[PDB]
Amino acid sequence: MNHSCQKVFEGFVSALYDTSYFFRNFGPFKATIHYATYANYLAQNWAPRVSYIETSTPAYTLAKNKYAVYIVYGLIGGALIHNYMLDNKAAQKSQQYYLKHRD
Amino acid sequence: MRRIFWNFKTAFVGLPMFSLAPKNILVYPIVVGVPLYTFIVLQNSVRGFAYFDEYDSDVKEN
Amino acid sequence: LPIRNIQFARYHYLAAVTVFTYFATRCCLLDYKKYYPLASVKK
Amino acid sequence: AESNDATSICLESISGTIKGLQKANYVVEHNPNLTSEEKKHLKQFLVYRYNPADPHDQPKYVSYWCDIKKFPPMFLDAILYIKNELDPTLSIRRSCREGICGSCAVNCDGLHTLACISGFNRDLSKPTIITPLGHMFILKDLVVDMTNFYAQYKMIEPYLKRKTPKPDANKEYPQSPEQRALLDGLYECVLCAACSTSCPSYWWHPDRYLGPAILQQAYRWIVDSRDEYTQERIERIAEDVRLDDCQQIGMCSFTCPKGLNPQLSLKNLMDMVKDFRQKRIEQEV
Amino acid sequence: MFKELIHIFRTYYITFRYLKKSNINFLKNLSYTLIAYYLIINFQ
Amino acid sequence: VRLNLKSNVDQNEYPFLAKWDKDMRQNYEEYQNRIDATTYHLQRSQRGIAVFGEWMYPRYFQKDILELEVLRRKQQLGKIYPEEVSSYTQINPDIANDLNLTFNAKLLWPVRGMTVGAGFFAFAHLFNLPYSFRLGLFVLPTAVELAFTWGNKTSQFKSIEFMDYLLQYRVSKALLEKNAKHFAEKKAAYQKEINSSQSVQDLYNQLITLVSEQAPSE
Amino acid sequence: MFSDFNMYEAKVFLKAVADAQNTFRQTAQQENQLARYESQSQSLLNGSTSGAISITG
Amino acid sequence: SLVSLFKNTFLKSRVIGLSFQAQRVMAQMAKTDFENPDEHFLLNDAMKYNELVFYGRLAENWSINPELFGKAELAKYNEAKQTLIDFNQYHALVQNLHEFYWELKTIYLELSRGVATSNFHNKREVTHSIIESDIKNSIHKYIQLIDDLKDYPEWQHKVREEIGYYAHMIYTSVNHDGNFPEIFKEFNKVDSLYYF
Amino acid sequence: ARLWWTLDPSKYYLKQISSGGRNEILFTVLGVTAAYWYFGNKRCEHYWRRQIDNCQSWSRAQNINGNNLTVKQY
Ligand SMILES: CCCCCCCCCCCCCCCCCC(=O)OC[C@H](COP(=O)([O-])OCC(O)COP(=O)([O-])OC[C@@H](COC(=O)CCCCCCCCCCCCCCCCC)OC(=O)CCCCCCCCCCCCCCCCC)OC(=O)CCCCCCCCCCCCCCCCC
Ligand SMILES: CCCCCCCCCCCCCCCCCC(=O)OC[C@H](COP(=O)([O-])OCC(O)COP(=O)([O-])OC[C@@H](COC(=O)CCCCCCCCCCCCCCCCC)OC(=O)CCCCCCCCCCCCCCCCC)OC(=O)CCCCCCCCCCCCCCCCC
Ligand SMILES: CCCCCCCCCCCCCCCCCC(=O)OC[C@H](COP(=O)([O-])OCC(O)COP(=O)([O-])OC[C@@H](COC(=O)CCCCCCCCCCCCCCCCC)OC(=O)CCCCCCCCCCCCCCCCC)OC(=O)CCCCCCCCCCCCCCCCC
Ligand SMILES: CCCCCCCCCCCCCCCCCC(=O)OC[C@H](COP(=O)([O-])OCC(O)COP(=O)([O-])OC[C@@H](COC(=O)CCCCCCCCCCCCCCCCC)OC(=O)CCCCCCCCCCCCCCCCC)OC(=O)CCCCCCCCCCCCCCCCC
Ligand SMILES: CCCCCCCCCCCCCCCCCC(=O)OC[C@H](COP(=O)([O-])OCC(O)COP(=O)([O-])OC[C@@H](COC(=O)CCCCCCCCCCCCCCCCC)OC(=O)CCCCCCCCCCCCCCCCC)OC(=O)CCCCCCCCCCCCCCCCC
Ligand SMILES: CCCCCCCCCCCCCCCCCC(=O)OC[C@H](COP(=O)([O-])OCC[N+](C)(C)C)OC(=O)CCCCCCCCCCCCCCCCC
Ligand SMILES: CCCCCCCCCCCCCCCCCC(=O)OC[C@H](COP(=O)(O)OCCN)OC(=O)CCCCCCCCCCCCCCCCC
Numbered sequence A: 001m002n003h004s005c006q007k008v009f010e011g012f013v014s015a016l017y018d019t020s021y022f023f024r025n026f027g028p029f030k031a032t033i034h035y036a037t038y039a040n041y042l043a044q045n046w047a048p049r050v051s052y053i054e055t056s057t058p059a060y061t062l063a064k065n066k067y068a069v070y071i072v073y074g075l076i077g078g079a080l081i082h083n084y085m086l087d088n089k090a091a092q093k094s095q096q097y098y099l100k101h102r103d
Numbered sequence B: 001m002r003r004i005f006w007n008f009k010t011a012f013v014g015l016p017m018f019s020l021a022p023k024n025i026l027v028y029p030i031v032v033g034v035p036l037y038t039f040i041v042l043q044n045s046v047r048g049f050a051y052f053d054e055y056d057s058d059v060k061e062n
Numbered sequence C: 001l002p003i004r005n006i007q008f009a010r011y012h013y014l015a016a017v018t019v020f021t022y023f024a025t026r027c028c029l030l031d032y033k034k035y036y037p038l039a040s041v042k043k
Numbered sequence D: 001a002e003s004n005d006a007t008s009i010c011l012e013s014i015s016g017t018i019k020g021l022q023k024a025n026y027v028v029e030h031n032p033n034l035t036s037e038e039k040k041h042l043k044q045f046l047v048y049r050y051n052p053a054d055p056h057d058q059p060k061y062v063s064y065w066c067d068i069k070k071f072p073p074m075f076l077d078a079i080l081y082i083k084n085e086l087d088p089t090l091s092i093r094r095s096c097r098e099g100i101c102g103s104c105a106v107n108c109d110g111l112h113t114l115a116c117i118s119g120f121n122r123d124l125s126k127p128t129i130i131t132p133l134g135h136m137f138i139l140k141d142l143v144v145d146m147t148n149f150y151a152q153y154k155m156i157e158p159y160l161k162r163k164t165p166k167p168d169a170n171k172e173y174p175q176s177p178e179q180r181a182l183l184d185g186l187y188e189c190v191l192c193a194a195c196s197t198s199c200p201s202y203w204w205h206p207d208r209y210l211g212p213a214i215l216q217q218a219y220r221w222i223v224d225s226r227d228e229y230t231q232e233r234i235e236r237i238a239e240d241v242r243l244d245d246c247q248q249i250g251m252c253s254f255t256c257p258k259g260l261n262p263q264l265s266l267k268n269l270m271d272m273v274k275d276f277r278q279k280r281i282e283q284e285v
Numbered sequence E: 001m002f003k004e005l006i007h008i009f010r011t012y013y014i015t016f017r018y019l020k021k022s023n024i025n026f027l028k029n030l031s032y033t034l035i036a037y038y039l040i041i042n043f044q
Numbered sequence F: 001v002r003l004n005l006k007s008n009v010d011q012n013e014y015p016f017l018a019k020w021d022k023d024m025r026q027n028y029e030e031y032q033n034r035i036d037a038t039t040y041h042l043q044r045s046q047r048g049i050a051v052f053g054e055w056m057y058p059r060y061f062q063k064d065i066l067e068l069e070v071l072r073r074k075q076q077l078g079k080i081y082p083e084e085v086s087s088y089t090q091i092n093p094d095i096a097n098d099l100n101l102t103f104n105a106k107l108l109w110p111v112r113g114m115t116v117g118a119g120f121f122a123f124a125h126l127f128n129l130p131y132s133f134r135l136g137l138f139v140l141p142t143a144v145e146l147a148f149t150w151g152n153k154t155s156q157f158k159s160i161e162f163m164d165y166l167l168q169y170r171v172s173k174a175l176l177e178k179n180a181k182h183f184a185e186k187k188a189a190y191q192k193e194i195n196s197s198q199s200v201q202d203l204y205n206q207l208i209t210l211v212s213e214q215a216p217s218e
Numbered sequence G: 001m002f003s004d005f006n007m008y009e010a011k012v013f014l015k016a017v018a019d020a021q022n023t024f025r026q027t028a029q030q031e032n033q034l035a036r037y038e039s040q041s042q043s044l045l046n047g048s049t050s051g052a053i054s055i056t057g
Numbered sequence H: 001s002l003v004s005l006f007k008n009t010f011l012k013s014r015v016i017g018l019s020f021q022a023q024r025v026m027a028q029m030a031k032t033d034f035e036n037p038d039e040h041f042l043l044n045d046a047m048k049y050n051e052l053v054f055y056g057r058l059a060e061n062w063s064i065n066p067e068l069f070g071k072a073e074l075a076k077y078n079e080a081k082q083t084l085i086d087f088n089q090y091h092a093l094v095q096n097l098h099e100f101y102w103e104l105k106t107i108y109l110e111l112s113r114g115v116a117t118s119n120f121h122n123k124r125e126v127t128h129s130i131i132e133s134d135i136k137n138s139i140h141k142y143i144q145l146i147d148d149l150k151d152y153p154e155w156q157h158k159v160r161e162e163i164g165y166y167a168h169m170i171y172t173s174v175n176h177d178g179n180f181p182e183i184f185k186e187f188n189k190v191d192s193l194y195y196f
Numbered sequence I: 001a002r003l004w005w006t007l008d009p010s011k012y013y014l015k016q017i018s019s020g021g022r023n024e025i026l027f028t029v030l031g032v033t034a035a036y037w038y039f040g041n042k043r044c045e046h047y048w049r050r051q052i053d054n055c056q057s058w059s060r061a062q063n064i065n066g067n068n069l070t071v072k073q074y
């Protein structure tokens, strides 16, 4: 490119590089990035799960790790069914209340 | 001056592409969607494609 | 080698894919405004 | 002194592409002073010519009409007849003349192959086109830059490495006839690169993906019973897409003029890599 | 699946080669988060 | 209903009431066809089975219901003139910017996006980038502008609010015109006694409060 | 319970009935609103003229 | 000091536990190439890699309370802290080399996009001066780096095999005319012969 | 071409924590509690509603400037 535009472009890219480097390596910003990276890693690679590799002999595996799936299913299904029953009960209660109040 | 060497009618990228690509791109689309789309559309119309006219269409202002 | 609850994992992944595709494409919830001209009327 | 040239370069590129599409397969007659009657008795060879050293030269087909009853029936024989009798400036690699060195690998009329052991269509009507290997940089005429092929070949460490000393030093590493026949049909590769220049994965990713030939050599050094760096080689070829990029097209085994089957070797390598990945977890526990 | 899409884009697009495996992983994490958010929100 | 296009109002005595009726009747047929299409879609979808239908009919077919309400209100209004939009600008300064994104009034060009694209083009021209890059950087801001412009169903809610306001205003204006002759004499008497332009309802509410506060109960 | 056709018949009829009741409401409200405006305007005029109140601004 | 007890126990547990793994992680990082040194950890198995990267800073910075430490325990903690600091420096070095590798690969990618067959819109016959200067300076820095690694034959060999690959491909991308003799003067000494 | 489709989980995410299986019950408890709270609020808002339409439901309108809204018959 034209050498004047070359000077402008070199200056601009140098400014961009310096800004990025400063923002990343500044003390507080560096600490924030460093902690957030590990938090993101924990969230992504250690999220709650129901399937995992079993490397232990049956004698060396807890019962929790053989019935965790069933406990989770019980909890979720019970929550859904109980919410459904609560919805029905609230429907009946509201209907009865507003009926006895008028018409 | 860009000089291109190309066998239009015999190279793998040529008429063979016209013969090949259209019949292979549309394999899953046809064979899956057409039955699936037909099922989705018809399952509503167990009785018919009837529009229950909620507005008085047969009524015209005098 | 053994994977605890592998079948559960397979079915969960399949269900996740199915639900995501269903909501993204709305394959099952089509639009019929285009068919109205090609439909009979009642009343 | 120079200025921005994005616009001029863009317009020139678009215009040149359009014109080249209009004037693709540009051809120049070597000897225009030929009566059409004579051409009935002579076969036509369209030979790719390009001399990047000369700044005024551009790629082009050159048409040579030759009497096929003056030399033996092979692509290399015709090329050398053209060179010696018609135009001795033609460039091509040739050492062995019997399909062993593998230097003469070229695109002999639509198929990558060794020119020394490949015949050509005897019919005088259909023209024959001889061009260099496709996706290799062209140095001059039918000579391509195979340097990257060799550089990739170097990265597989193709030398017998052994972790156990020889018991007596007055013998030879024992290997039964079965452990030798395991290599039969696998050590005959002449590194012609004809197969690898026909692999689409090698077209797209020449550097990150080793060619079918180099991977076949890695397989040869792996299956060899005398070497003890089996797992190490497997792990080395398991990086990124050095092997994973292969899509089992199978053109490699179809083009191989030696009759080898690099596709099967790559398939076995993939199976071994998968087993290595699984048993790095299963075994160490 | 995601891996395959990234592989195709890398193998066919020359420009896409610019991205590191780290950037690809960041896109993977963002896409997984967005997919989880989509699944959860659609039912709300 | 297949209403005729010829209004039965007298233009000489109720001009605005005649114009409103004329526009309503003119656009009624088209808006009725759209409403019928929407209702047919809704009921056919409700006839579905399980996930394809009933199980999720009322809750997931929300855009269709919103379109139906907008169509019904617009059909009742018929046509909208800029004077009313500027009138409602008091409570919603972006009424025009919202009423453009709900109705197919005029074609919208992403002018801001195209301006940003031209700026990026100038940048590239200065720094000698390939033309492909600058064409892509022209498309990209345009794409962003289009994505942020279309959709935007909140503008449809604001359009519904404005159309309700406009319908109430037009009804009251028609009532004003209908009884204008009857109130001519009373108006002439009133203007000469009260120098205020404030409404009668507001003044009477203030008077009622004044009586309730100061007037002796006795 | 009942075929969908009958359900839509009921829906249309109920919409019509609700519209009829709204018609009654609109008629009565418009009439009485006109009467109310007349009465309030006359009351303000009488108040100002009688000197009971002074309406400024 | 209950909070001090918990802080010190957390630090001890994490630091000592990871110190037993630093060897493995560093070896794996060495094993891969410089394009994505953490490729194995992102794709195959995160063998306490992100844990090391996170806890190196804590080992460097967070304070210690010796009265909560034993004698042998304190010696072990100091050893583990030194190992984590070594890992920090090693990761910094690998990152620097990886970024230099990506500089060279960026140059090569520009050349490849230049010579791509789909590039019907930006086809250039003659290399422009800017990229030539970039190539020359990049090769100069690469030669200086190779010289600086004379005491570490394995590191020098890896740097050659990895980074110089794209220098060789750049060498192959262009004709031997114009300024070519001057641009690749340093490369022609030893490296060019290696990549044949 | 190579076959790659499969429903099996990837070994990259299949690791356990040191003390046992992944934190599944602990997170499911939180999820159930949050769902209970959210759905309870939604149900309470939805079911206990009525529409009362009378004069007292209407108030005097005003501009964003606070003044009373009145539009002339221009
Ligand atoms: C600044 C920080 C950095 C930011 C970076 C930028 C990005 C953001 C990052 C933020 C960090 C979090 C990101 C989200 C997590 C990402 C996870 C991931 O990518 O993993 C990939 C990774 C992929 O691995 P893979 O190898 O591909 O395998 C995946 C397969 O699906 C294999 O799956 P699986 O088989 O292992 O299954 C997984 C498991 C996971 O599920 C669980 O165990 C979890 C359960 C729910 C817990 C919810 C807890 C929520 C707590 C919230 C508390 C409040 C928070 C408030 C915060 C406010 C702010 C402080 O599923 C189940 O448990 C299945 C349950 C099915 C129930 C079925 C019910 C049956 C009922 C009937 C019973 C029987 C009746 C019989 C009747 C018979 C009649 C005849 O996923 C996993 O392996 C883990 C499982 C998936 C977890 C998904 C979690 C998503 C969470 C999204 C949260 C969004 C919140 C937004 C809040 C906004 C506020 C403003
Ligand atoms: C004005 C209007 C204009 C409209 C149009 C505008 C333009 C629109 C965009 C157009 C461009 C789109 C480009 C997409 C490229 C995708 C990659 C590709 O081509 O594949 C190559 C590559 C080929 O691999 P290969 O190794 O050569 O395959 C050979 C093997 O032998 C094969 O191995 P195998 O034989 O063992 O495999 C067995 C087979 C197993 O399957 C089968 O054998 C058959 C399966 C049949 C499934 C039938 C489903 C039916 C229900 C749904 C139907 C919905 C549509 C129809 C609805 C109505 C009618 C029913 O596996 C597969 O088939 C794998 C793929 C299918 C998996 C099933 C799930 C697919 C859907 C995933 C979710 C999509 C969400 C979209 C959200 C979009 C948001 C914007 O495939 C992949 O990459 C696979 C993964 C793809 C994942 C894509 C996920 C979505 C990505 C969204 C973002 C994309 C952004 C793109 C750039 C945008 C502009 C900057
Ligand atoms: C309506 C709603 C809104 C719609 C628009 C939404 C837009 C959202 C934002 C999009 C942002 C795109 C840019 C970022 C992605 C990465 C780009 C990139 O690699 O940057 C560097 C790369 C340039 O690299 P380079 O070093 O200059 O090139 C040399 C390399 O060797 C090149 O190596 P390479 O392999 O990297 O290069 C391949 C390159 C492709 O670039 C190229 O190398 C060539 C591009 C031009 C090709 C033109 C066709 C060539 C002839 C083919 C045969 C056509 C026959 C047609 C007639 C048939 C008759 C039967 O691939 C891409 O660009 C990747 C992404 C492409 C898809 C996303 C963009 C879609 C834009 C669609 C609208 C375009 C404007 C309107 C056009 C129509 C006006 C009436 O890309 C650019 O800077 C250009 C970006 C694309 C500009 C538009 C070109 C036309 C594309 C049309 C695609 C149509 C697909 C079908 C569905 C369309 C539905 C709308
Ligand atoms: C809107 C929604 C918001 C919420 C949701 C957000 C969702 C998205 C994710 C967000 C991710 C990014 C977050 C922002 C980045 C923050 C960066 C940062 O902290 O900068 C510090 C960092 C300086 O620290 P440094 O350089 O790393 O350290 C050297 C220093 O000289 C200092 O040396 P030193 O030794 O004097 O002091 C070291 C220590 C202060 O030292 C102490 O006094 C001790 C601190 C606790 C140590 C751990 C004890 C654990 C004991 C067991 C607990 C068990 C609990 C029950 C469970 C049991 C069963 C498992 O100070 C720190 O460095 C604090 C860092 C943050 C906490 C680190 C501890 C993590 C573990 C404990 C909490 C998590 C529970 C784990 C439970 C399981 C454990 C197995 O850089 C700055 O100064 C930047 C300042 C500007 C940025 C913003 C600053 C915000 C400050 C927030 C403080 C929060 C304190 C904890 C509150 C807990 C409430 C319940
Ligand atoms: C709930 C409402 C409030 C939420 C607040 C969230 C605040 C987050 C702030 C984060 C600040 C930066 C943190 C930096 C790291 C410092 C700590 C550390 O290094 O780890 C120490 C400790 C041990 O780490 P390590 O020794 O390195 O172990 C890993 C090694 O690989 C060694 O492994 P190992 O084999 O030796 O085993 C060690 C084991 C040891 O781990 C444990 O012992 C922890 C086990 C769990 C907790 C156990 C205690 C439970 C009781 C706590 C009671 C607290 C009461 C507090 C009262 C306060 C009163 C004022 O480690 C683990 O297993 C790690 C578990 C990681 C879990 C990650 C969960 C991801 C998904 C989250 C969302 C799910 C949504 C599902 C929705 C689905 C709907 C369908 O780990 C943790 O503290 C885990 C924290 C995980 C969550 C952090 C990020 C949460 C983000 C949520 C999404 C929000 C998005 C909002 C939008 C974005 C903008 C706002
Ligand atoms: C709204 C906008 C819509 C616009 C629609 C535009 C459609 C575009 C379709 C493009 C198809 C794919 C080709 C272009 C993109 C290629 C991308 C890629 O990765 O390729 C790189 C590669 C090229 O690069 P390469 O081969 O050098 O590979 C890279 C190798 N290294 C890394 C070493 C450099 O592939 C190609 O580009 C191949 C191009 C083939 C071109 C074929 C043209 C056929 C024309 C047919 C015309 C028929 C007319 C009929 C008229 C009839 C009249 C009666
Ligand atoms: C040139 C152009 C270039 C263009 C480049 C564009 C790149 C775009 C890349 C990003 C987009 C990729 C989209 C891929 C398709 C979507 C697939 C999907 O929905 O799943 C995502 C992911 C699992 O899919 P994937 O990781 O791809 O495959 C794993 C195989 N084992 O799923 C996840 O991991 C998400 C987390 C949840 C997974 C499911 C969890 C189990 C399901 C049950 C949860 C139960 C919760 C509690 C109970 C609720 C119900 C009662």
Ligand code: SF4
Binding pocket: D102, D188, D189, D190, D191, D192, D193, D194, D195, D196, D212, D213, D216, D255, D256, D257, D258, D259, D260, D262
């Ligand atoms: S793989 Fe086949 S084509 Fe390639 S060099 Fe060996 S024998 Fe020749």
Ligand code: F3S
Binding pocket: D198, D199, D200, D201, D202, D212, D245, D246, D247, D248, D249, D250, D251, D252, D253, D262, D263, D266
């Ligand atoms: S031709 Fe090509 S990609 Fe694979 S198996 Fe054969 S090499």
Ligand code: FES
Binding pocket: D076, D093, D094, D095, D096, D097, D098, D099, D100, D101, D102, D103, D104, D105, D114, D115, D116
């Ligand atoms: S000429 Fe000898 S093998 Fe080719």
Ligand SMILES: [Ca+2]
Binding pocket: D221, D222, D223, D224, D225, D226, D227, D228, D229, D230
């Ligand atoms: Ca061996």
